[PDB]
Amino acid sequence: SFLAKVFKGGVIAVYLSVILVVGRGLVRGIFTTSPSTVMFTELPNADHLLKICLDIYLVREAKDFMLEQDLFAKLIFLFRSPATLIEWTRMSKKKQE
Amino acid sequence: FDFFNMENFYAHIFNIKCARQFEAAYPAPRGIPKGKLVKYMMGFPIIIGVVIFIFSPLLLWSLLNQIGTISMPEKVTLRISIEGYPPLYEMEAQGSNHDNAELGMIKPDQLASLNQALTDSYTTRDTNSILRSRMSVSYLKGYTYEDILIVRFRPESEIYWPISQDSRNAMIDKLSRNTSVNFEVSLEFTRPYDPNENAALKHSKSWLVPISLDMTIRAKIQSALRGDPGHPILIPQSIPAFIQVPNQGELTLPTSIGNTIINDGNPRINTTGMEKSDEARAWFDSLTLNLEQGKSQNEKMWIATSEHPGDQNAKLWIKTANTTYSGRPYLQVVGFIDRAFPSFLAKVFKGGVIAVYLSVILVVGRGLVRGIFTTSPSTVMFTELPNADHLLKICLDIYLVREAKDFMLEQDLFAKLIFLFRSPATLIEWTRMSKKKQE
Amino acid sequence: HTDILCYFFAIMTQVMTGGLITLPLPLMSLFWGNLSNPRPSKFFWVTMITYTECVIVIKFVCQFAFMPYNSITWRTEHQMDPMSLDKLFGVSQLWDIVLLFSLFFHRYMLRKLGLWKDANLPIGRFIHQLFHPKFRYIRDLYPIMFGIDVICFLIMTFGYSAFGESRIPVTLVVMLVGMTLAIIIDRALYLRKSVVGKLIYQVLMIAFLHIWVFLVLPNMTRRSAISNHVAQALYVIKSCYFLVSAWQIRNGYPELCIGNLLTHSYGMTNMIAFKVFMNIPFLFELRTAIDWTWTDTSMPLFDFFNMENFYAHIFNIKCARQFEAAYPAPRGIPKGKLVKYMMGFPIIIG
Amino acid sequence: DILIVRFRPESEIYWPISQDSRNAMIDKLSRNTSVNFEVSLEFTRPYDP
Amino acid sequence: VVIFIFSPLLLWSLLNQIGTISMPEKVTLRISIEGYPPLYEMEAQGSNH
């Protein structure tokens, strides 16, 4: 009578139900990468977008909400057209320069 | 991670190309509407599956409830005693055939007579009598003649009185003072084994009638207990006449019959503003006890006798038997037996069940089903491709190079694939359908 | 619209007593008046008047004392059974304000006759109602029917203890909910210009409802009519559905411009409506499958679902833009202290 | 796992019956009613905390 | 991955742990006529076996 046994079949169901969600979702996401999230996750040099991301905060500190609003559309457009994103995140050249 | 990305890309390309080939392997007139058959050969199935998926965990619940039944008791016993002492009178009735006089069923004649008696106790003017008769008849008619038992105990106790001299002296000396002394009436029913759940269900109930503080009453009780010839110990409002036996727990009194008796017919007292403890016990029967003793002090038995409250033979009472062995009336108790056990898993807050019952219905549809039927507004540039035969070439060629070493070509051809999933213009250019047909 | 009032009061006076003596009143009223013409020819009204006078007379006679419905025996014995003889036979047995619905119906029936005096004054029946109505009135009342059906499904659900004899959820509730969902589907199929289909539909459902409410449910739930205070509401709502369906049947179908009754006004109410429509599970997909199975398309089902998703997305985007534009807002001044505490504060607490 | 229980032939206590119950026994057996015997056996385990 | 797959079985196998109990120490037998005090009652006790 140690906890007896609730329909072992039902136990196995849950025992698998958990094995499912975890792998079919979390583990999948962790090991692997969606065919859509390739243009964003890998970028040769992500130093130009960080400049804007810091600059908007810097402007925010010193008021000037006009520049604060005019520089958010500039960022929102970079995630719209992949050609400009690829152009801007390309690796820098001073080394052979 | 690049390995996993490449394998995912290969799987996607393989699936797309193969789906295109399978679709092309079956020509189909570009125009004529879907045939009536085809539609009913595809649409119909879905609807039925969705409906059964929605309404299945209710069907299984309805099959799972399955309110069970149990058999009626086979053992009854009653014990009358003074508080904190061995019982004065103990009597039991056994049997399982339900035909003997000790434990017998109820004939339809008695049930019909009692039902007729219930209705005529009212008076034309008073509406409270109307409501009381309505409630009492509604309660009585809820049990068929197969769910009512008539228990009959013998007046004489089955065994002698097993008391010592010192305990009797303690009884007398306790009664001498101005302390509080109580009586005790206990009744219990026993069920049959019931294998499925283990154990024999037992129902017991105990009443307590306090003794009056007047010195004369205590003197009479002391004279009776000492063993004097004529002293009929009297206890009022002790044993009921109707008892409801639930499926589990303590015995329950039928309250509607009490309201029908203490109010209709001839009202009995209830005019002194009695407390609620005796308000619900005002329709009980009274008991009297005598001591027979005999030749010696070893033989000491107690004989009990019941008296009805209010007016006797008011047609609301079932006639008793005059016994056979030696002649005095049986002690009769009528029991309404309830045999509708629903403890099958009982019920955890049905609301909580419904919550989970819906919680599951939610995740499945709001996620899996959605993904399966329908398509994200983002995954259109990839899922449908007019001709996915050029990407499969690269996907196979990278493996072919991998087999023959040459890791330089192996690495220089992975960026070529990674760039095709970056710029949609080149993807659309490359996956466009081929031209040799009109070429 | 006094005739609609007469039908409504006939339904009320039938549900008030729940017998079969009054049953010919609504049965005949529906079958004849709601299917004949805009004007039942002024002879049907005479028949209704005569039957109402007769029923008033007999139910006044049956409310006497020498006859066996006394308070001594019969009332007490038959108080609990739902389908014995006197409960079953209309008015034959108390009532505080007694029955006023029949009297009010009679008064309004004579008011209708007086209004008829004030103004203006069976193969042929089907031929007139179906083939020669002539002035087709082009209207489209289906959303009202859907609202009525939604109101009834929840009353079948939220109220479940009455339909069953913690108690048991009962196996019959499942049959009722499945059957009601099937009727909801059947409405959708018959929304494709099938007048004779709708006529057979209405006859079948009126017959089924009338027999089931008064002759089967009392035997199942062990609750007599009048005492069941929720089934009467279902009867009334279904009767309103029957009246509007009869109105639709008598007139001609409209062009039926395909589209939800949510894509006409681009307001804030449509947002809540569409959001609850697409938020509850197993509804969008069910509606899409029901639509595609019984409408003339050329694309397979997956393209149908993709198109519906695209339409929903476009509708939501455009409507959100309009709602945002409907409230001008100074481009510059920072968020007011109130607004912030009228929005931020709530979230934190939740 | 096998036990050999041995009860004494003689009963441990006397017969605690009254005259009236014995008369009831005899009179019930006199008629053509149905009368049954009864043999009951029970084992008791240790506390098991 | 292997331990994640095969752990909730290992924990089940450790969790079962079929227990044991000790043998009875009290027995009794009662022979009677139906609906009457017992004719013969006898019990046997002991724990040393």
UniProtKB/Swiss-Prot annotation, chain C:
Piezo comes from the Greek 'piesi' meaning pressure. This is Piezo-type mechanosensitive ion channel component 1. Belongs to the PIEZO (TC 1.A.75) family. Pore-forming subunit of a mechanosensitive non-specific cation channel. Generates currents characterized by a linear current-voltage relationship. Plays a role in reproduction by positively regulating inter-tissue signaling to promote oocyte maturation, ovulation and fertilization, and sperm navigation from and to the spermatheca. May play a role in regulating cytosolic and endoplasmic reticulum calcium ion release. Residues 64-93, 220-228 are cytoplasmic. It comes from Caenorhabditis elegans. Residues 25-42, 186-198, 250-344 are extracellular. Glycans are attached at residues 34, 120. Expressed in the pharyngeal-intestinal and spermathecal-uterine valves and in multiple reproductive tissues including the germline, somatic oviduct, and spermatheca. During reproduction, it is expressed in sheath cells, sperm, both spermathecal valves and the spermathecal bag cells. Disruption phenotype: Reduced brood size due to defects in ovulation with incomplete constriction of the sheath cells impairing oocyte transit, an accumulation of ooplasm in the uterus as a result of 'crushed' oocytes, caused by incomplete opening of the spermathecal-uterine valve, which in wild-type allows the fertilized oocyte to be expelled into the uterus, and sperm navigation defects. The lineage of its organism: Eukaryota, Metazoa, Ecdysozoa, Nematoda, Chromadorea. It is found in: Cell membrane. The chain crosses the membrane at residues 4-24, 43-63, 94-110, 144-164, 166-185, 199-219, 229-249.
